[PDB]
Design an enzyme around this catalytic site. Structure first.
Site, mmCIF file in Angstrom:
data_model
loop_
_atom_site.group_PDB
_atom_site.id
_atom_site.type_symbol
_atom_site.label_atom_id
_atom_site.label_comp_id
_atom_site.label_asym_id
_atom_site.label_seq_id
_atom_site.Cartn_x
_atom_site.Cartn_y
_atom_site.Cartn_z
ATOM 1 N N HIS A 139 22.849 41.021 -6.909
ATOM 2 C CA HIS A 139 22.372 40.933 -9.291
ATOM 3 C C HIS A 139 22.138 40.073 -9.348
ATOM 4 O O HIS A 139 22.081 39.115 -8.543
ATOM 5 C CB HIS A 139 24.058 41.289 -9.143
ATOM 6 C CG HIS A 139 25.423 42.224 -9.015
ATOM 7 N ND1 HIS A 139 26.576 42.733 -8.648
ATOM 8 C CD2 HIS A 139 24.555 43.863 -9.030
ATOM 9 C CE1 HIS A 139 26.710 43.198 -8.481
ATOM 10 N NE2 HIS A 139 26.170 44.091 -8.937
ATOM 11 N N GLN A 191 21.367 44.222 -1.190
ATOM 12 C CA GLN A 191 20.907 44.229 -2.691
ATOM 13 C C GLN A 191 21.669 42.983 -3.424
ATOM 14 O O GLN A 191 23.119 43.036 -2.859
ATOM 15 C CB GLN A 191 21.508 45.986 -2.716
ATOM 16 C CG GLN A 191 21.297 45.811 -4.647
ATOM 17 C CD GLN A 191 22.017 47.204 -5.183
ATOM 18 O OE1 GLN A 191 22.298 47.289 -5.498
ATOM 19 N NE2 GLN A 191 22.089 48.255 -4.641
ATOM 20 N N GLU A 226 18.851 43.778 -8.345
ATOM 21 C CA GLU A 226 19.462 44.564 -9.930
ATOM 22 C C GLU A 226 20.101 44.182 -10.298
ATOM 23 O O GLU A 226 20.648 43.101 -10.644
ATOM 24 C CB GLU A 226 20.829 45.379 -9.247
ATOM 25 C CG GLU A 226 21.734 46.192 -10.089
ATOM 26 C CD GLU A 226 22.986 46.998 -9.699
ATOM 27 O OE1 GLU A 226 23.818 46.673 -8.614
ATOM 28 O OE2 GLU A 226 23.716 47.606 -10.987
ATOM 29 N N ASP A 241 30.587 44.493 -4.333
ATOM 30 C CA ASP A 241 29.641 43.814 -4.858
ATOM 31 C C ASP A 241 30.762 43.852 -6.756
ATOM 32 O O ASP A 241 30.748 44.062 -7.581
ATOM 33 C CB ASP A 241 28.473 45.212 -5.839
ATOM 34 C CG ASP A 241 29.311 46.456 -5.988
ATOM 35 O OD1 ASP A 241 30.573 47.033 -5.819
ATOM 36 O OD2 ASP A 241 28.793 47.352 -6.041
ATOM 37 N N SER A 266 26.244 46.633 -2.130
ATOM 38 C CA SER A 266 25.751 47.217 -3.203
ATOM 39 C C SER A 266 25.457 46.375 -4.238
ATOM 40 O O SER A 266 24.915 46.869 -5.703
ATOM 41 C CB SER A 266 25.419 48.682 -3.513
ATOM 42 O OG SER A 266 26.958 48.412 -4.119
ATOM 43 N N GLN A 274 25.717 54.833 -3.667
ATOM 44 C CA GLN A 274 26.397 53.417 -3.861
ATOM 45 C C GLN A 274 27.688 54.199 -3.794
ATOM 46 O O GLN A 274 28.715 54.816 -5.179
ATOM 47 C CB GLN A 274 25.734 52.842 -5.189
ATOM 48 C CG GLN A 274 26.777 51.360 -5.723
ATOM 49 C CD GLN A 274 26.325 50.468 -6.370
ATOM 50 O OE1 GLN A 274 25.994 49.213 -6.499
ATOM 51 N NE2 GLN A 274 25.779 51.523 -8.004
ATOM 52 N N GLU A 278 20.270 54.112 -9.622
ATOM 53 C CA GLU A 278 20.867 53.727 -9.368
ATOM 54 C C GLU A 278 23.264 54.034 -9.600
ATOM 55 O O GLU A 278 23.807 54.668 -9.797
ATOM 56 C CB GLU A 278 21.614 52.937 -8.083
ATOM 57 C CG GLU A 278 23.007 52.312 -7.421
ATOM 58 C CD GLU A 278 23.087 51.032 -6.908
ATOM 59 O OE1 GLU A 278 23.173 50.096 -7.238
ATOM 60 O OE2 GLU A 278 22.571 50.637 -5.306
HETATM 61 CA CA LIG Z 1 24.255 47.961 -7.404
#
Ligand SMILES: [Ca+2]
Ligand code: B12
Ligand code: B12
Ligand SMILES: CC[C@H]1O[C@@H](n2cnc3c(N)ncnc32)[C@H](O)[C@@H]1O
Ligand SMILES: CC[C@H]1O[C@@H](n2cnc3c(N)ncnc32)[C@H](O)[C@@H]1O
Ligand SMILES: [Ca+2]
Ligand SMILES: [K+]
Ligand SMILES: [K+]
Lengths: 135, 553, 178, 552, 136, 178
Positions: free
Chosen positions: B143, B141, B170, B335, B362, B296, B221
């Site tokens: 950003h 995942q 995200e 993250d 994440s 998460q 999330e």
């Molecule tokens: Ca995240």
């Protein structure tokens, strides 16, 4: 429905309807452009959510299934009402009778029996733990 | 005199990090605390009357929630009686299948499972993780943000991220009222890079749900949970309000997970004398009890708290393992920045990268960290080549792939043009051909022309104020010449109708084919079993830039 | 030794003032913030920033909580203008307004290490400009991504110690400043 | 041009060397379609077929391995066992190491390669913590400098010993310096912690002569190779290397071989075989010779496997094969291969997380600019990162945080001890100014220059006049260092008992030998085998910068 | 000797002699300073190496043991002769009969019967693999 | 194209010359060293350095092996002074001497990427000075610890390609240089 029936989009697309009783194959770009479909039939139905709940149970995930069962009931609750109920379950927002009235509304107006029970349980334990309005 | 050896050591980046000794009494200790409760449960029929030393009359709201919903009561008393060392042995034993373990681990109390994993070193936790992870295939995942909330850049960065292999992406905002543009730009850009990528826009909890009812996001999330009642209350929530909000998302066909992470409670000063790992386990059981499919965790934004104390990064791995052992999808942090040292942040990344989780990070930053609106990730866009080289070195599938520059130029260009037609077809402020060019070749927001924020803000507000929905975006793409992107957008909205991807660890691959822990069950059983990097996927990861061919050598 | 309680803080009755609400240990068990800035200098900058905009600055100490949000909620319940400034011992600051939900705010400063005395004075100006029903530009702070993980552990230690001075069910005390 | 790819192009990792696989010529790390199918044929106590090759086609390596290298008791039984099943047993926590070693030693080279090739690096690491011969993991350091300054060598050696290294290794920039480097290393090591073993890596014959004089404790750089052409072009055979090995033991000196994936294809004579298969041949040569341990993990050829896919995983595989054959494993991490901190940390963690007998066989205890092995994967400036990671993960990487005033005191004592040695032996003097510089130095940039010509002349006289280690002891006892002198004698006494000749032997405590014989790895899953705990944990916990809450 | 007898320095120090018939206890600093012991006394015996071989076998290391048994024989061979034999086993240095002569010397003069067989094996296979003098 | 075979190389008899021995692919299948220095310029600098010291340079090509040491051994066995220089296609260089063991040498240059045209000229100068029975300071090269990691794999590929031009039992050929 079992894990053999998953995913529905591949094993049984004919089983998925919309909140305005349109089928899944109606979702072609043609029907979108003509306004033959628009935002409101892009809403998952309680039947779909109860099929996924059944599949979640077959895959050994009872709690996920119960979440889906609550979700199936909440499809009938308007967008603004959902946020109002969420805000009232927050600590010190409600009295015990207000929460019980909320569950009453959920049950008697939207047939949301599981969500009503969930809210009444909260109301009971917010008394025990002093998370109500005026505490 | 001073030693010049120690002067050289004093200039090293790692010595700029924050370290503290343990404060056991206050709960400033990662794990293995003597204050943690002894495992216990009292059952027979119906309900729990004692949970980890606490009688039912003493339950806080969290004990109640966990006791009533969070434990597989069919086997709790049997697994409570099993020796914790033997149970740890089974976790990392390759011959005890995941499907034999989940009934037992879901039956342990929070203190039981914390005691079980505390017997394990990180090699054993990693061995157990590659078995306990719910989805067979690991993923990643990203950003996708920039400091100006420039929607054109967000779309092009989202397309590159999707092309590199991120299956979830995200975004968030610097300026609150830009959010509808960020969500739409992220969603269009992601579908251009690879149709089926899931997008989220992290906002305040009520504003996030409204964007999802409009059709501009796929999942959510950042709904947080906490491990002590005082901290949960100070977050203005209870387990019941979080659970109701969880079912609210599913009712709108939106996948969601909770966010927690070790260290949140002691940071607020209300750890109740317990260790970070014990309090994080409570959070994981809250998530399981709410019926939420994944979580998460891995300290996330509190990473500076466990990373300052001994065994803190091991504890972060332990909470990821607990999450997966409880049959939840695990989006295992990585993250947030926490160290000035490349060696140290690599070691922390490797804990999840080597075994694989449902989402190894994440929130890998797909932009340079200066553009990262979550205040920076453990990895950023400038680490892509390193990340790809390590995959090739170790034969580890870390969810990404090497890419050709001209392919990325082509996909960023198309994403910028696709968003330019959306802004044209919806009456939003124009995207100029100059902005398209700049976003095609940009590295970050430093390479982008400035926009009229005041005018962009007004029109983005009017998207939620007037309930303008994701089907208008589909129409604009169909009409600006992007019927291929338009159909992909309609396939995404069609996935919300089926509910297939609401399930554990679900992503969408190929041509709208859902891949989750239901049909892609992890079936690890030791060497040469489970997920293996091989075939065309291996050939993709092999083909890094700079690999000279002998025929041209 | 520059702060002195002078009795339970009265509720302001005219839209004339901004309340600076400080935490339980502020200027007592701790005298500097997370990066060494003295509490006295911090207090003097915020006070002066308020009074330079023609608004009186009243200082109170809160006791029911060490959370910067709830400290400022206690403040804005007593502020005649409804505007309050919550300040923890470690330096976290929030501009609050009565009627806003407790975890909402006008302006928040969640990285105490990145705050200078310039910022503290500017926070005072903006709070009084909010009390004067103006719409000032938000206070600009420095940015450093390494600041959060570098100091999170120490701020947790400082918060824990300040939480030891919470006393249940005790109302704010007004303070006189030197 | 994309500014995103410009930024990526500036990244250090993009300065490393990468090539696509060349299967036909053996430029592939492992899993080559060219590798032979495992097979063995036993007729009346002798191998007549090995991995598809008949005895009439054996090269000298096949003969050596077939006659001495394979446990023929169970070779046919394990050959028929499923390779996945065997790989499962390797990383299964409930299959004891003592149950596996009879099976792994009975495998042919192609069989064990096929087995480990079924494993990912998490599985490999899980097997390594069981299969490692010694229960306690350890570390080995490089101690060199660009001037062969003996005072700085002794100081750095004392610091390395104090930080925790249990073997320390030197070598020369100028070949005729070698006697001074050996003595300086031995004296310095005994000052930092009595019991640390030392070696001085040179040409093979010269190195054994130094060992006969008593100036070293072990040898390691004796090389073996995986194809007969490459072995011949190294001017040796398995019998000449096996004879050299027993020669070391006949003088009470511990020794190990050195090998590493990539050596054969780098010479261009891989015979179409993968790097991992050829290294397995190297490992079985070591087993067949009766050598207790092996320095492997590519070592100086590291840029060869690291350029091709799965190369670093293959490096971990060869360490795992070594330990599975009941050999001590000194698992490299001793040579630079990348410009990228992330990449070299991932490569180190393959051995650091499970632990090997020597996690590195050459962690640079000096800054890399002083490293006369041309740079290690880790150097002195990584010390604090290394201790933080031990603390972060609760992993015993064999080192510990140290106080600056303690290192200052131990570097001073070592420089002064060598000053007494150089005085009592009639060697060019070591001035107090040189002691002061060595006490506070980071590297040779901080040391006064010596007359390299005079130093060279006197170091040669040590060899030419057969001046032995006992004269070093006598010089210490007569120059104010009886305590150091006793410790040096105890080291020489260890060569008389033979105790430290055994698998993985080091000397801890007060002359207590700790080896795979009395410190047997007994791993049986979580909470068993070696665990970081107790006083060792408190030691690793106490890094510099760890603020105490009561301070704050 | 078995693993229980390991280490010899702790369990059987009285068993540990030197090749010049000195004991472990003689190696004190007083004897070193007076030259009552010297470096030529600091040599491991064949007996010690054979005890260690027996311990390696009890520990499951047959090949290590065999190396020790060869080393026990080589203790009697002088330093320079050790190097001479190492050099002769390197490729293209020796003819078959010089290797056999070395093997004969090892057996008859030093009683090094395992090493003799080891060298005779080299001589035989150096013929088969063309590694003798005049083969390059 | 700048090297012509003129027949099997003769035995030098006068301490008068240095033999440059090049690998089987030098100047043919490969025309540049590992970092792109042309073989023509390399040979020209080495010859210039030898002749600068008043010594003759004789160039030969070896076919029996591609290892730089054995190429040099072939050279020093024919050299009238006993001194030779072996140069592989990828640039590795050794100064060798008749009488030394095959793997010993006077000077070895084992990192081809670190040689410049100036280095190759010094190599020739030193070789001739060895032939005049002087003891010159070894040729210095730049230090670079990343050279071996960066170029090892490319070095191996270039060596595999030169090894294909080995011919068993073919005597060295004397070369004529343009
Ligand atoms: Ca995240
Ligand atoms: C770590 C963190 C938390 C932690 C710890 C908070 C605590 N009180 O101990 C946890 C996960 C528990 C948390 C909870 C919340 N947080 Co928070 N948090 C952060 C974060 C990522 C870093 C702060 C930090 O470590 N600074 C470095 C340290 C060394 O400096 P410091 O001055 O000591 O930092 C303190 C304050 O930041 C304070 N704090 C943290 N969060 C919040 C939120 C609010 C409303 C307040 C008043 C204070 C506060 O906690 C820190 C130490 O105690 C910031 C993001 C950012 N931009 O910094 C968000 C952030 C400050 N949090 C935010 C929010 C929304 C919340 C919650 C309301 C979320 C929720 N619905 O549960 C709660 C409120 C909790 C409370 N009662 O204060 C928002 C604030 C938005 C705003 N303007 O009001 C931020 C900016 C994140 C964002 N990008 O939107 N948070
Ligand atoms: C990798 C390496 C090897 C490899 C590959 C050799 C090969 N021919 O392919 C292996 C492990 C097989 C090896 C073997 C030997 N090596 Co070596 N090797 C190195 C090392 C570490 C790196 C060289 C490198 O990669 N350079 C970078 C590349 C890109 O440049 P290059 O010019 O293409 O490098 C080539 C040469 O260095 C050559 N080479 C390597 N070693 C030797 C040794 C000799 C005598 C010769 C002539 C050439 C040579 O091989 C490289 C690739 O073909 C160097 C030390 C160093 N850091 O320089 C020692 C080094 C060059 N080796 C050395 C020695 C002693 C040997 C052996 C005799 C050891 C032995 N007893 O087995 C053999 C000789 C084998 C032979 N016939 O060439 C010594 C040379 C001393 C000297 N001045 O004479 C060095 C300097 C190491 C040292 N510490 O002294 N070596
Ligand atoms: C600012 C608090 C917010 O940051 C996110 N967050 C980051 N780390 C944590 C954490 N460790 N626990 C709970 N929430 C977290 C989450 O979205 C929460 O609402
Ligand atoms: C210069 C060759 C020398 O370097 C050492 N060496 C380094 N890497 C390897 C390796 N991979 N194989 C064999 N020997 C190696 C060994 O001492 C050998 O004699
Ligand atoms: Ca070494
Ligand atoms: K937590
Ligand atoms: K090898």
């Amino acid at each position: 429905a079992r894990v053999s029936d998953y995913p529905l989009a591949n094993k049984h697309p004919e089983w998925v309807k919309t909140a305005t009783n349109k089928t899944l194959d109606d979702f072609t770009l043609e029907n979108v452009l003509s306004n033959k479909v628009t935002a409101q039939d892009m809403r998952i139905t309680p039947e779909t959510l109860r099929l996924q709940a059944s599949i979640a149970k077959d895959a050994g995930r009872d709690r996920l299934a119960m979440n889906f069962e609550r979700a199936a009931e909440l499809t009938a609750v308007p967008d603004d009402r959902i946020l109002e109920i969420y805000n009232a379950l927050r600590p010190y927002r409600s009295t015990k009778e207000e929460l019980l009235a909320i569950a009453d509304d959920l049950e008697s107006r939207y047939q949301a029996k599981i969500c009503a029970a969930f809210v009444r349980e909260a109301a009971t334990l917010y008394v025990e733990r002093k998370k109500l309005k005026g505490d | 005199m001073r030693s010049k050896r120690f002067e050289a050591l004093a200039k090293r980046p790692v010595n700029q990090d924050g370290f503290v000794k343990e404060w056991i009494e206050e709960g400033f200790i990662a794990m293995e605390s003597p204050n943690d409760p002894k495992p216990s449960i009292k059952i027979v029929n119906g309900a729990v009357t004692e949970l980890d030393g606490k009688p039912v009359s003493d339950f806080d709201l969290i004990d109640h929630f966990i006791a009533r919903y969070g434990i597989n009561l069919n086997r709790a008393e049997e697994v409570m009686a099993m020796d914790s060392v033997k149970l740890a042995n089974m976790l990392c034993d390759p011959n005890v299948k995941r499907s034999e373990i989940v009934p037992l681990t879901t039956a342990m109390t929070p203190a039981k499972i914390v005691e079980v994993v505390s017997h394990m070193n990180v090699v054993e936790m990693m061995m157990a993780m590659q078995k306990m992870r719910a989805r067979r295939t690991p993923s990643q995942q990203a950003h996708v943000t920039n400091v100006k909330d420039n929607p054109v850049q967000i779309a092009a960065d989202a397309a590159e991220g999707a092309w590199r292999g991120f299956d979830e992406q995200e975004t968030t905002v610097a300026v609150a009222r830009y959010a509808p543009f960020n969500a739409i730009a992220l969603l269009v850009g992601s579908q251009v890079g690879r149709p089926g990528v899931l997008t989220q826009c992290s906002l305040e909890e009520a504003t996030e749900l409204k964007l999802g009812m409009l059709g501009h996001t796929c999942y959510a999330e950042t709904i947080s949970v906490y491990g002590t009642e005082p901290v949960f209350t100070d977050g203005d929530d209870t387990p019941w309000s979080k659970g109701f909000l969880a079912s609210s998302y599913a009712s709108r066909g939106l996948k969601m997970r909770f966010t927690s992470g070790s260290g949140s409670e002691v940071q607020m000063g209300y750890a109740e004398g317990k260790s970070m790992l014990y309090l994080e386990a409570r959070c994981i059981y809250i998530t399981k009890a709410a019926g939420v499919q994944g979580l998460q965790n891995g300290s996330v934004s509190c990473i500076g708290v466990p990373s300052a104390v001994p065994s803190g990064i091991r504890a972060v791995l332990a909470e990821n393992l607990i999450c997966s052992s409880l049959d939840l999808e695990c989006a295992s942090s990585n993250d947030q920045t926490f160290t000035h040292s490349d060696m140290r942040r690599t070691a922390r990344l490797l804990m999840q990268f080597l075994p694989g989780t449902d989402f190894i990070s994440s929130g890998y930053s797909a932009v340079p960290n200066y553009d990262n609106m979550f205040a920076g990730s453990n990895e950023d866009a400038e680490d892509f080549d390193d990340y790809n080289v390590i995959q090739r070195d170790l034969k580890v599938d870390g969810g990404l792939r090497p890419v050709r520059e001209e392919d990325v130029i082509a996909i960023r260009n198309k994403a910028a043009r696709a968003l330019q037609a959306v802004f044209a077809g919806m009456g939003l402020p124009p995207i100029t051909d100059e902005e398209v060019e700049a976003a095609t070749y940009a590295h970050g927001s430093k390479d982008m022309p400035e926009r009229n924020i005041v005018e962009d803000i007004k029109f983005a507000q009017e998207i939620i104020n007037k309930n303008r929905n994701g089907l208008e975006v589909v129409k604009a793409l169909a009409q600006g010449g992007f019927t291929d992107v338009a159909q992909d957008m309609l396939n995404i909205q069609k996935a919300k109708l089926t509910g297939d991807y609401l399930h554990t660890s679900a992503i969408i691959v190929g041509d709208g084919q859902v891949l989750s822990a239901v049909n892609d069950v992890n079936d690890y059983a030791g060497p040469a079993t489970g997920y293996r990097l091989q075939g065309e996927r291996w050939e993709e990861i092999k083909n890094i830039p700079g690999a000279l061919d002998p025929n041209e050598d | 030794g520059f702060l002195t309680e002078v009795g339970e803080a009265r509720q302001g009755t005219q839209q004339d003032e901004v309340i600076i609400a400080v935490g339980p240990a502020f200027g007592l068990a701790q005298t500097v913030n997370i990066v060494g800035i003295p509490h006295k200098s911090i207090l003097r900058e915020v006070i002066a920033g308020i009074e330079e905009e023609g608004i009186k600055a009243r200082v109170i100490r809160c006791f029911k909580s060490s959370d910067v949000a709830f400290v400022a909620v206690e403040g804005n319940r007593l502020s005649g203008s409804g505007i309050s400034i919550g300040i923890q011992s470690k330096g976290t600051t929030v501009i609050h307004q009565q009627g806003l939900p407790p975890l909402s705010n006008l302006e928040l400063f969640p990285q105490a290490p990145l705050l200078t005395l310039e910022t503290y004075r500017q926070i005072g100006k903006n709070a009084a400009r909010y009390a004067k029903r103006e719409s000032p530009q938000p206070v600009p702070t420095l940015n450093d991504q390494m600041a959060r993980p570098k100091y999170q552990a120490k701020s947790a230690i400082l918060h824990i110690k300040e939480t030891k001075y919470v006393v249940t069910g005790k109302n704010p005390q007004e303070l006189r400043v030197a």
